[PDB]
Amino acid sequence: GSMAKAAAIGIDLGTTYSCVGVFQHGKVEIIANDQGNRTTPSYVAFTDTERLIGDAAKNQVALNPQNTVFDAKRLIGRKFGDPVVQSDMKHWPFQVINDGDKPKVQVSYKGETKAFYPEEISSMVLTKMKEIAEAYLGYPVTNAVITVPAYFNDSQRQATKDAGVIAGLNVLRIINEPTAAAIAYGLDRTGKGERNVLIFDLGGGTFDVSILTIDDGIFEVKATAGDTHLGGEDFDNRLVNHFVEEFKRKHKKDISQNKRAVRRLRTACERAKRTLSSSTQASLEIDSLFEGIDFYTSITRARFEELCSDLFRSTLEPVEKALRDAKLDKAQIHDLVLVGGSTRIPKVQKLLQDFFNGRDLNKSINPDEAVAYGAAVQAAILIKSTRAAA
Ligand SMILES: Nc1ncnc2c1nc(Br)n2[C@@H]1O[C@H](CO)[C@@H](O)[C@H]1O
Numbered sequence: 001g002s003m004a005k006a007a008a009i010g011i012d013l014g015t016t017y018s019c020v021g022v023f024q025h026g027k028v029e030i031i032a033n034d035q036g037n038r039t040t041p042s043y044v045a046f047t048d049t050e051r052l053i054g055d056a057a058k059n060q061v062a063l064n065p066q067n068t069v070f071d072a073k074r075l076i077g078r079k080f081g082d083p084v085v086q087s088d089m090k091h092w093p094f095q096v097i098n099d100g101d102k103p104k105v106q107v108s109y110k111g112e113t114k115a116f117y118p119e120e121i122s123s124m125v126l127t128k129m130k131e132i133a134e135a136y137l138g139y140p141v142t143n144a145v146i147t148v149p150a151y152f153n154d155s156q157r158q159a160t161k162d163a164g165v166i167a168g169l170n171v172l173r174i175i176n177e178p179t180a181a182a183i184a185y186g187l188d189r190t191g192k193g194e195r196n197v198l199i200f201d202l203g204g205g206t207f208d209v210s211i212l213t214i215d216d217g218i219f220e221v222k223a224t225a226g227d228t229h230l231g232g233e234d235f236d237n238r239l240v241n242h243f244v245e246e247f248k249r250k251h252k253k254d255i256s257q258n259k260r261a262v263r264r265l266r267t268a269c270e271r272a273k274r275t276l277s278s279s280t281q282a283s284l285e286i287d288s289l290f291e292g293i294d295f296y297t298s299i300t301r302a303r304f305e306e307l308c309s310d311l312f313r314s315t316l317e318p319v320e321k322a323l324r325d326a327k328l329d330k331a332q333i334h335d336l337v338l339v340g341g342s343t344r345i346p347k348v349q350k351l352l353q354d355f356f357n358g359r360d361l362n363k364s365i366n367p368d369e370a371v372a373y374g375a376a377v378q379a380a381i382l383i384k385s386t387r388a389a390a
């Protein structure tokens, strides 16, 4: 009579990393890609012979900086003249050009100079997320829910839909990232009455705080606040500056002018930073870092916490601003939800918990996966077509 329907997917299309999930058998499965990664870099690289997307693109970025595109989400639905775009362009090694006051990324690809709209680069990331899901399900996927930041305007939301259509996806709905994180915890399924939820999202490059009110499963965004210049990369920069100084003291050598040595140092720092989230100390072991000198050292969690102390404390300023804008007191918040890999930092958790007088934080769903988790829950609800009984 009626053939079984393919599962719909939930995609968190992130600035730095993207994540895909599917709700099946009453639960969400976050789908690992072919390299065993549960998140995929939102990177696209172009060469004379190939277009590489995800881990393959991010792994060759060092020697191909001009033709490896990342951060397309910072350009999507914006005008070339927009002050945000103009400032961001100084930090990017790839070219951003002006086509009718719309930004386009220009690269060398398959023997030619090619320019792409931000939605086209995002469609390439969505194509990879769709293939990751089809590799797991074993059949073609058509339907998806895609998430966006709560502050995205109409043009930014329509360009995200356009990226989905280019990728061959039927976009069921564009939903806000803080709403998707709330849905992941079933915070819209608690019945009658108003609930105030604070979502604390600390990413690779930006920090966002959102206050939502939920009444009978209906979501209302009450306040948004954040810091565009606060993220995981700033903590990596503090460790980099620390070890450059340490090398200078120990071997009387300044490494800061050899890009490879700085890159190898930064790569090792980011991994030590992750180790320090579950360990009280971490080893740093780099062979022939500079002038054939082996750099074998360590860092305690206490020293790392001291190095980033001002940055961690500054996450509380947008929390207080969001609470003032929502016209609420901290005691009136019912649920605290953590989003982003940088929220695994014990000191970040301790500061926020202390601010809310020892309250529990919802962190049981991996914070780098919560948004895709909620998007997958919503995607399964949106494709239901039940006919009422008599
Ligand atoms: N366990 C973790 N402890 C500390 N930081 C982490 C962890 N896992 C992830 Br993922 N990160 C950081 O989150 C950001 C995501 O773009 C990057 O800066 C990652 O370094």
Ligand SMILES: [Mg+2]
Binding pocket: 014, 177, 201, 203, 339, 340, 371
């Ligand atoms: Mg995110």
